[PDB]
Amino acid sequence: SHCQKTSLRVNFEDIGWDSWIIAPKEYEAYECKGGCFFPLADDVTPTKHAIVQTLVHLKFPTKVGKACCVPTKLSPISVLYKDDMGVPTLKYHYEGMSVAECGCR
Amino acid sequence: SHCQKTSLRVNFEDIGWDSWIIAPKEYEAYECKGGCFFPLADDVTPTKHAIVQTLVHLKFPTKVGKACCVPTKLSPISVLYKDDMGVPTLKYHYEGMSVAECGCR
Ligand SMILES: [Cl-]
Ligand SMILES: [Cl-]
Ligand SMILES: [Cl-]
Ligand SMILES: [Cl-]
Ligand SMILES: [Cl-]
Ligand SMILES: [Cl-]
Ligand SMILES: [Cl-]
Ligand SMILES: [Cl-]
Ligand SMILES: [Cl-]
Ligand SMILES: [Cl-]
Ligand code: NA
Ligand code: NA
Ligand code: NA
Ligand code: NA
Ligand code: NA
Ligand code: NA
Ligand code: NA
Ligand code: NA
């Protein structure tokens, strides 16, 4: 109904990253989906500008766009990548790959 | 062309806040407009998940949405508000009201 985290399995070969990512083949990135219209939920954690823009968009829908459900906190994953030498190397904390929290911004 | 900060003057009476905000009558909130498609600019400061989602959306446009140009840093303003007593009170740093930086998230 509103801004929330939903599932999103990403295949690295489909996005053209299999050339430098050996493993894993796929991973769970999640995504943020849902509207930011009023009334909001108790755990949306919206900013005051997101609230203002939503109100302005309600009054002028053709001139001002809506606020967006977006990742507000990200989590790392581990990836096995080949470096310039070409040897499998483990990046233990490859930051910013998975959604931890969603929100209206 | 891409994700950037553009002007947005917000009238407090139009958004139904004039009941508790005496001054100012309007203020400059800015907004974030633009696409997040490739190729990106040098100052978009995108997250890796925003990059992954943009790639996945390119491959599956009907199943995965695009990343969004959103405020990544906010600035405060000062407002003159009437409190429960009804006396004009100055909120010097009313946080989160103006866009400082935009970005793809
Ligand atoms: Cl609400
Ligand atoms: Cl805020
Ligand atoms: Cl690491
Ligand atoms: Cl650790
Ligand atoms: Cl990293
Ligand atoms: Cl690029
Ligand atoms: Cl990141
Ligand atoms: Cl203050
Ligand atoms: Cl100060
Ligand atoms: Cl505040
Ligand atoms: Na995929
Ligand atoms: Na897939
Ligand atoms: Na309009
Ligand atoms: Na650990
Ligand atoms: Na306005
Ligand atoms: Na106006
Ligand atoms: Na598709
Ligand atoms: Na000051």
UniProtKB/Swiss-Prot annotation, chains A, B:
<feature type="disulfide bond">
    <location>
        <begin position="36"/>
        <end position="104"/>
    </location>
</feature>
<feature type="disulfide bond">
    <location>
        <begin position="3"/>
        <end position="69"/>
    </location>
</feature>
<feature type="region of interest" description="Interaction with ENG">
    <location>
        <begin position="78"/>
        <end position="92"/>
    </location>
</feature>
<comment type="similarity">
    <text>Belongs to the TGF-beta family.</text>
</comment>
<comment type="function">
    <text>Potent circulating inhibitor of angiogenesis. Signals through the type I activin receptor ACVRL1 but not other Alks. Signaling through SMAD1 in endothelial cells requires TGF-beta coreceptor endoglin/ENG.</text>
</comment>
<comment type="subunit">
    <text>Homodimer; disulfide-linked. Detected in extracellular fluid as mature homodimer, and in complex with its propeptide. Interacts with ACVRL1, BMPR2 and ACVR2B with high affinity (in vitro). Identified in a complex with ACVRL1 and ACVR2B. Has ten times lower affinity for ACVR2A (in vitro). Interacts with ENG, forming a heterotetramer with a 2:2 stoichiometry. Can form a heteromeric complex with ENG and ACVRL1. Interacts with type I receptor ACVR1.</text>
</comment>
<feature type="disulfide bond">
    <location>
        <begin position="32"/>
        <end position="102"/>
    </location>
</feature>
<protein>
    <recommendedName>
        <fullName>Growth/differentiation factor 2</fullName>
    </recommendedName>
</protein>
